[PDB]
Amino acid sequence: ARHCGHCPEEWITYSNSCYYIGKERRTWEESLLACTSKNSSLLSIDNEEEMKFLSIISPSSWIGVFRNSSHHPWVTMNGLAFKHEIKAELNCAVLQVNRLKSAQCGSSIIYHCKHK
Amino acid sequence: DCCSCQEKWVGYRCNCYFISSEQKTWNESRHLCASQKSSLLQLQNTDELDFMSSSQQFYWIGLSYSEEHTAWLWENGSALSQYLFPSFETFNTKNCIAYNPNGNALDESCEDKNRYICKQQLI
Numbered sequence: 001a002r003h004c005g006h007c008p009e010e011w012i013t014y015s016n017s018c019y020y021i022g023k024e025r026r027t028w029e030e031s032l033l034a035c036t037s038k039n040s041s042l043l044s045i046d047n048e049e050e051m052k053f054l055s056i057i058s059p060s061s062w063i064g065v066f067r068n069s070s071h072h073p074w075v076t077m078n079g080l081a082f083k084h085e086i087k088a089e090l091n092c093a094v095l096q097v098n099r100l101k102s103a104q105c106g107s108s109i110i111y112h113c114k115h116k
Numbered sequence: 117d118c119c120s121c122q123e124k125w126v127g128y129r130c131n132c133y134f135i136s137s138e139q140k141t142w143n144e145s146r147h148l149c150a151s152q153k154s155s156l157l158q159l160q161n162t163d164e165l166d167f168m169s170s171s172q173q174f175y176w177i178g179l180s181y182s183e184e185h186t187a188w189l190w191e192n193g194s195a196l197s198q199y200l201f202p203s204f205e206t207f208n209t210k211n212c213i214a215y216n217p218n219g220n221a222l223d224e225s226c227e228d229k230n231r232y233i234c235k236q237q238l239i
Contacts, residue, residue, distance in 0.1 A: 001129075002118060002129070002130040002239075003118060003129060003130050004118040004119040004127050004130060005118065005119060006119050007127075011128075012126050012127060012128045012167050013119065013121060013126065013127035013128075014124070014126050014127075015123060015124060019167075021166075021167045021168075021170075023169070023170075052137075053124070056135055056137070056168070056171065056173070057126075057135075057167060057168050057170070057171070058168075058170045059170055
């Protein structure tokens with residue numbers, strides 16, 4: 001029962017970042033706090049190519065991107081403007097099969113975590 | 117070391133995995149993995165691809181029939197456990213095995229094109 005030291009015991013390495021494919025559905029804020037508790041951050045998306053890879057491994061996940069309301073711009077948890085386009089009362093982002101979807105923040109949805 | 121795994125292979129339980137997007141024949145898959153200095157997936161148990169358990173894709177794995185041993189074997193020569201795939205009784209011995217990280221194996225014409233998974237051990 002051995003593992004790559006850089007990541008924890010049940011996580012995966014991919015491109016200089018660890019991943020937890022979560023398998024428990026949670027609210028957006030519940031996912032965020034869930035990941036931070038595990039000493040990392042809710043799924044962030046860097047490239048379009050990461051996205052395609054992540055779409056092989058799991059169909060749906062919250063990503064760390066949000067709005068206060070219908071129109072202020074989409075914001076990351078690093079405090080930046082989210083430069084990838086994302087598709088009523090939907091103020092939190094979710095990655096669902098190689099697309100960025102708007103979703104109601106109170107929906108229970110699968111969440112992944114990712115390391116810098 | 118355990119933290120090998122090219123760039124863009126996935127590392128898990130001190131193994132490295134390559135999950136294809138490209139679809140190839142069972143033999144072509146076998147050689148591509150061999151060209152990457154790895155083997156077509158040998159499954160030691162289903163939890164091995166837990167990280168990918170949501171997939172609804174079938175992937176060629178490294179299991180083929182041996183007329184000599186009257187049994188299905190991995191590419192390294194080690195035997196299949198009976199409990200791993202319970203339908204194995206009914207696998208057609210001229211076919212190759214495709215596998216869904218779900219837990220479901222299907223025997224299929226080896227000349228069918230499928231995605232494939234390569235795996236490197238590390239010890």
